[PDB]
Design a protein around this ligand. Structure first.
Ligand code: CHL
Ligand code: CLA
Ligand code: CLA
Ligand code: CLA
Ligand code: CLA
Ligand code: CLA
Ligand code: CLA
Ligand SMILES: CC(/C=C/C=C(C)/C=C/[C@@]12O[C@]1(C)C[C@@H](O)CC2(C)C)=C\C=C\C=C(C)\C=C\C=C(C)\C=C\[C@@]12O[C@]1(C)C[C@@H](O)CC2(C)C
Ligand SMILES: CC(/C=C/C=C(C)/C=C/[C@@]12O[C@]1(C)C[C@@H](O)CC2(C)C)=C\C=C\C=C(C)\C=C\C=C(C)\C=C\[C@@]12O[C@]1(C)C[C@@H](O)CC2(C)C
Ligand SMILES: CCCCCCCCCCCCO[C@H]1O[C@H](CO)[C@@H](O[C@H]2O[C@H](CO)[C@@H](O)[C@H](O)[C@H]2O)[C@H](O)[C@H]1O
Ligand SMILES: CCCCCCCCCCCCO[C@H]1O[C@H](CO)[C@@H](O[C@H]2O[C@H](CO)[C@@H](O)[C@H](O)[C@H]2O)[C@H](O)[C@H]1O
Lengths: 165, 217, 212, 194
């Protein structure tokens, strides 16, 4: 398929891998009773193992000669062949959360700079203010862009200290 | 002072006289997206275009849907009409969309330049004598002129009332479309068919029992 | 704020000030305050007349034709339910008749609207300029050639009240035809005969409970 | 002022009284700016004159039995020889486009540099009907009203052909035969239902 890979659902090595893991679990099972606590736990593990291998095949992943899933990172190849969920979609999932955390922290830091004693507002968190800013961060991408266009996102070069040069 | 949530503190930026001049101002801005006055002016235009586009689209899903059930028309489901139309069509969907982007892009571009410089499209000689009627009105997002053939915007007494009706039906239409999308995945049927099912047995056919919305239950 | 001298839909009830008896049939009924805004109430005043006047014609056009058929009077259209007149075949197709209907109504309705927008501005015959309506006519009450018998020269206020009372009752009747026809499945006069046959056991409570 | 398009309505201020064909009809105020009105005044007359020739040509072709206005140019796509009053014409599609483009460009180019002359006269008025100032006023009104009627008539040909797929004279005869059976309502397209 892509880069010589093949769908895991059609991969011989992938299928053989599932048998090896289930065989290992089954070997430990036969040293216990039918419905003892250890036996139930082992059976639960085997169910998750079977579900995991079905899910990855159902997801249409690609397996190499190793018979293990490989991920596609190029946006063009991902959207071309329906691998957007491996790296492309999770890319924009992380950035939203990462920007959320960073934007919320920046809002709080600016908020307390106006207080009389900013340092004491950092070791001892102002929880009522932090919760207020935590919820308003859901719209950070909109607020972040508008700050950039209005020119209030960055400090002036003349207001930043620098070493002799 | 009507508000979306009585007893709550209206955001300060929504209480200014400029903000209260906006139709449908019920003080709803919990995330503070409109704090910057320049941003709120831009988001108001976005709502109007979303409102008007949603109303036209919903009317195109709902009215054909009811008439189809009544037997006066035969129109496929809104989520199938795209495939049905392209078959007995003079062009493939690639060519059809490319033209759509040129025409929409050109028209949208003129609207864009009016947001940046209101009344700037009435530049003498810019259009083939038609620029005079493209100046818009004193209110951004309400062009008027050739876009108001019946002149319903010339009655000062009814002006505020008309704008409120548009935003109210527009907001309702926007939610309706979000319901069409969610109800297609949830139930796998048409909008009017979903309504028929609910009315038959309201207490057993709803989102609480569709087996999707509440996975824990 | 409405005075207590005027008739009231609910005696001893406070009523809106803006319903001060100027309009005919002003009994102060507006629990939802729809007509509070004078501009809107100006529109609703004409809408009531238009919906009422058509309703009076429609109800008359649904009972009299059926009444004649029972009496035995014979005409080609006899014995056709009011909701089956559309299916009936006439000298011309329904579509062609509909097209003519809108073209004819477009002229008269826009003529009527022009007067409402600017009263007295549509009182002249476009072709035979000699013809003209009286200049004192108000919106909704053209007069002139529309009042050939001069009834409007008498107690006009009473006549306006009589018109709106009959009109309001007629509008309710037509809603009865749709509700009754959709439920009973028979013509209106048939429902009346059934009720008179056994008034006590033929109420809507009896009829609808049986169905479900 | 020629008249009033909507009796009981006011005339727009920006429309001059002496402008020929002035019925005070400008609901959209497209001619409010004097610069825009000057261009549109010329364009209405130019459209009217072209429409009047177009309508006359469309009716003449079908009355004389040589076809209808719609299928006259089919010989080019189908493959054939042009005809005019039944006599063969040697030119082909490529030759016609080249000569038409050159001739129209030269004639229209000359008018373009004039600056917006709608009533040139002189060489274009050999019989001198409009030489007298007083007489010209009414002739201009007659020209535009016939021109406006021709513009509407041609729109009727195109719209009617799309619905019925027939020529203008064919449709007129059909309507006369069965007035209540053949009309826009009965063509199955103009009125969505029925
Ligand atoms: C006050 C306005 C008004 C009202 C309340 C009605 C109400 C009605 N009309 Mg009527 N019409 C009205 C005005 C008019 N109608 C017509 C022409 C017709 C026709 C031709 C028909 C009706 C029929 C109907 C019924 C529709 C329900 C039904 O049985 O559907 C089920 C429909 C059918 C079983 C008919 C199937 C065959 C039909 C040829 C298909 C095409 C029907 C059209 C789409 C109807 C369009 C009606 C619209 C314009 C009001 C219902 C009783 C129908 C009827 O009487 O059914 C018993 C019918 O066939 N109307 C005209 C044109 C002159 C009107 C103009 O204003
Ligand atoms: C990090 C850098 C990087 C690199 C090395 C590649 C590499 C590749 N990309 Mg990807 N791509 C990237 C980033 C990158 N991409 C980004 C950031 C985006 C936008 C989110 C895309 C969007 C994209 C699309 C839409 C497509 C590719 C495709 C390709 C392949 C051939 C064309 C190409 O991009 O040539 C070298 C790359 C560059 C010079 C960098 C810019 C690449 C642009 C954005 C895309 C060019 C597409 C090209 C015109 C398609 C022509 C048809 C093709 C079959 C020959 C190649 C494997 C094509 C593919 O699937 O081929 C099988 C394809 O259709 N890429
Ligand atoms: C955002 C608005 C919108 C959009 C994008 C669409 C999109 C679509 N509509 Mg819908 N529609 C809308 C609004 C919209 N509609 C509204 C408001 C109504 C009225 C309630 C309808 C009623 C309607 C019907 C009845 C039908 C569609 C159909 C269609 C398809 C295109 C048909 C075609 O090829 O037309 C090409 C022609 C044009 C774009 C030019 C306009 C031509 C019309 C006849 C002019 C009418 C003028 C009017 C009388 C004044 C497509 C899925 C058809 C479909 O689903 O087919 C499978 C179909 O049967 N629409
Ligand atoms: C709102 C007013 C209204 C409307 C829309 C209609 C409509 C209709 N009437 Mg009704 N009618 C009305 C008022 C109305 N009527 C009134 C006030 C009366 C006096 C009692 C009648 C008496 C009447 C009779 C006696 C008959 C109709 C019939 C008809 C049908 C044919 C009309 C026709 O071609 O007349 C002829 C055209 C001209 C006079 C022009 C049509 C469905 C006929 C019908 O339903 O036949 C099946 C029929 O027999 N009407
Ligand atoms: C109960 C019915 C009724 C009554 C009492 C009135 C009363 C009035 N109308 Mg109104 N009108 C009605 C129904 C009625 N109208 C209907 C249904 C229509 C629609 C066609 C109109 C259309 C109308 C117009 C266009 C005008 C009036 C005018 C008038 C005024 C003078 C005429 C008059 O006194 O007629 C008294 C009416 C009767 C005694 C009705 C008797 C029964 C008749 C003959 C019909 C029988 C039908 C048959 C049983 C089938 C007066 C306020 C005029 C006005 O305001 O002038 C200043 C005026 O211009 N009316
Ligand atoms: C103009 C008013 C009017 C009149 C005189 C009638 C008369 C009749 N209706 Mg109808 N009806 C009306 C309006 C009217 N209806 C309306 C507006 C609707 C829609 C909700 C219906 C829905 C309806 C149904 C579903 C049924 C009837 C039935 C009946 C019958 C009486 C038994 C019953 O269940 O009544 C129920 C009706 C009502 C409670 C009417 C309430 C609304 C009106 C406007 C009240 C008016 C009161 C006022 C004092 C005037 C009285 C009449 C006046 C002439 C003195 C009888 C033939 C039944 C039938 O056909 O039995 C064989 C039947 O099944 N009607
Ligand atoms: C806007 C004007 C206009 C245009 C563009 C056309 C275009 C056309 N006409 Mg039409 N026509 C028009 C006006 C017009 N006509 C008028 C006003 C009349 C009435 C006199 C006619 C009468 C007419 C007839 C009778 C016929 C056409 C035909 C044609 C076709 C061939 C023309 C040709 O080869 O001419 C070539 C002309 C010349 C070489 C002579 C040029 C003019 C001389 C110098 C005039 C001398 C006086 C073509 C589609 C023919 C057709 O339909 O074929 C299928 C056809 O048979 N036309
Ligand atoms: C434009 C739109 C829909 C357009 C639909 C169209 C053209 C459909 C067209 C067609 O269907 C037809 C006719 C026929 C079909 O055959 C084909 C297609 C092509 C499919 C919907 C918008 C829909 C838009 C929606 C639902 C937007 C909702 C926004 C919300 C709720 C925002 C809330 C807040 O932002 C505020 C206001 C303030 C903040 O402080 C707080 C939060 C909470 C963040
Ligand atoms: C309908 C039309 C224009 C209509 C305009 C309208 C209603 C404008 C209305 C308003 O703007 C006002 C005034 C004022 C605003 O406030 C309001 C609105 C409402 C906006 C023009 C037609 C214009 C029509 C024209 C120019 C037609 C030309 C036809 C020709 C040359 C035909 C030639 C041939 O037919 C032959 C002879 C033989 C065939 O074989 C070959 C061919 C080539 C087909
Ligand atoms: C069209 C215009 C918009 C909609 C108008 C709605 C108001 C009129 C409703 C009429 O409702 C109507 O429905 C059926 C026709 O469809 C009628 O049904 C009746 O007529 C049938 C013929 O058509 C017959 O087989 C029976 O007598 C019965 O089924 C109902 O007896 C009547 O209540
Ligand atoms: C759609 C066609 C695409 C191909 C290119 C089209 C080019 C069109 C050029 C038209 C030029 C018209 O020019 C003429 O009228 C102009 C407007 O009144 C005048 O200005 C010019 O002095 C005059 O010569």
């Amino acid at each position: 398929d892509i880069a010589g890979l093949t769908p895991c659902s059609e991969s011989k090595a992938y299928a053989k891998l599932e048998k090896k893991e289930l065989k290992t679990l089954e070997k430990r099972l036969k040293q216990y009773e039918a419905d003892s606590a250890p036996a139930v736990a082992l059976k639960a593990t085997m169910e998750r193992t079977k579900a995991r291998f079905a899910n990855y095949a159902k997801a249409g992943l690609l397996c190499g000669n190793d018979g293990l899933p490989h991920l596609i990172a190029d946006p063009g190849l991902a959207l071309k062949y329906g691998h957007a969920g491996e790296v492309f979609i999770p890319t924009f999932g992380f950035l939203y959360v990462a920007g959320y955390i960073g934007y919320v922290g920046r809002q709080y830091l600016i908020a307390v700079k106006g207080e009389a004693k900013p340092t004491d507002k950092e070791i001892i968190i102002d929880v009522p203010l932090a919760t207020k800013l935590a919820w308003q961060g859901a719209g950070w991408p909109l607020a972040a862009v508008q700050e950039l266009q209005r020119g209030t996102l960055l400090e002036k070069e003349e207001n930043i200290t620098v070493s002799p040069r | 002072r009507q508000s979306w949530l009585p007893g709550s503190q209206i955001p300060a930026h929504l209480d200014t006289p400029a903000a209260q001049a906006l139709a449908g101002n019920f003080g709803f801005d919990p995330l503070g997206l409109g704090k910057d006055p320049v941003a709120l002016r831009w988001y108001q235009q976005a709502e109007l275009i979303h409102c008007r586009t949603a109303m036209a689209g919903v009317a195109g899903i709902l009215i054909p849907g009811l008439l189809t059930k009544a037997g006066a028309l035969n129109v496929p489901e809104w989520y199938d009409a795209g495939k049905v139309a392209i078959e007995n069509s003079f062009a493939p969907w690639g060519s059809l969309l490319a033209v759509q982007l040129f025409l929409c892009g050109f028209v949208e571009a003129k609207r864009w330049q009016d947001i940046r410089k209101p009344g700037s499209q009435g530049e003498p000689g810019s259009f083939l004598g038609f620029e005079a009627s493209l100046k818009g009105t004193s209110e951004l997002g309400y062009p008027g002129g050739p876009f108001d053939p019946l002149g319903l915007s010339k009655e000062a007494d009814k002006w505020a009332d008309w704008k409120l009706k548009e935003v109210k039906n527009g907001r309702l239409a926007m939610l309706a479309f979000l319901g069409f999308v969610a109800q297609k995945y949830a139930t796998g049927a048409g909008p009017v068919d979903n309504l028929a099912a609910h009315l038959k047995d309201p207490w057993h056919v709803n989102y609480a029992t569709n087996g999707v919305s509440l996975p824990f239950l | 704020k409405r005075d207590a001298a005027l008739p009231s839909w609910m005696p001893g009830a406070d009523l809106p000030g803006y319903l001060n008896g100027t309009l005919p049939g002003d009994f102060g009924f507006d629990p939802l305050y729809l007509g509070q805004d004078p501009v809107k109430l100006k529109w609703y005043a004409q809408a009531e007349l238009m919906n009422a006047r058509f309703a009076m014609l429609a109800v008359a056009g649904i009972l009299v034709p059926e009444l004649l058929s029972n009496i035995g009077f014979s005409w080609p259209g006899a014995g056709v339910a009011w909701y089956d007149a559309g299916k009936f075949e006439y000298f011309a197709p329904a579509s062609s008749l509909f097209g003519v209907q809108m073209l004819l109504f477009a002229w008269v309705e826009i003529r009527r609207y022009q007067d409402f927008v600017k009263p007295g501005s549509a009182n002249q015959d476009p072709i035979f300029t000699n013809n003209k309506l009286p200049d004192g006519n108000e919106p909704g009450y053209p007069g002139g050639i529309f009042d050939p018998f001069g009834w409007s020269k008498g107690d006009i206020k009473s006549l306006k009240l009589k018109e709106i009372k009959n009109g309001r009752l007629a509008m309710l009747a037509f809603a009865g035809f749709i509700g009754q026809a959709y439920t009973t499945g028979t013509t209106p006069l048939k429902n009346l005969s059934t009720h008179l046959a056994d008034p006590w056991s033929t109420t809507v409570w009896q009829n609808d409970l049986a169905r479900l | 002022k020629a008249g009033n398009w909507l009796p009981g309505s006011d005339a727009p201020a920006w429309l001059p009284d002496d402008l020929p064909g002035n019925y005070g009809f400008d609901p959209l105020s497209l001619g409010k700016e004097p610069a825009s009105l000057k261009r549109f005044t010329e364009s209405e007359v130019i459209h009217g004159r072209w429409a009047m020739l177009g309508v006359a040509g469309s009716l003449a072709v079908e009355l004389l039995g040589y076809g209808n206005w719609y299928d006259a140019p089919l010989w080019a796509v189908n493959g054939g020889k042009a005809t005019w009053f039944g006599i063969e014409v040697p030119f082909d599609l490529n030759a016609l486009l080249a000569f038409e483009f050159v001739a129209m460009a030269a004639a229209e180019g000359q008018r373009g540099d004039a600056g917006g002359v709608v009533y040139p006269g002189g060489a274009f008025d050999p019989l001198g009907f409009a030489k007298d100032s007083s007489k010209s006023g009414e002739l201009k009104l007659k020209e535009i009203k016939n021109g406006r009627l021709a513009m509407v008539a041609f729109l009727g040909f195109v719209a009617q052909h799309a619905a019925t797929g027939k020529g203008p004279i064919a449709a007129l005869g059909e309507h006369l035969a069965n007035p209540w059976g053949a009309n826009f309502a009965t063509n199955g397209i103009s009125v969505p239902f029925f």
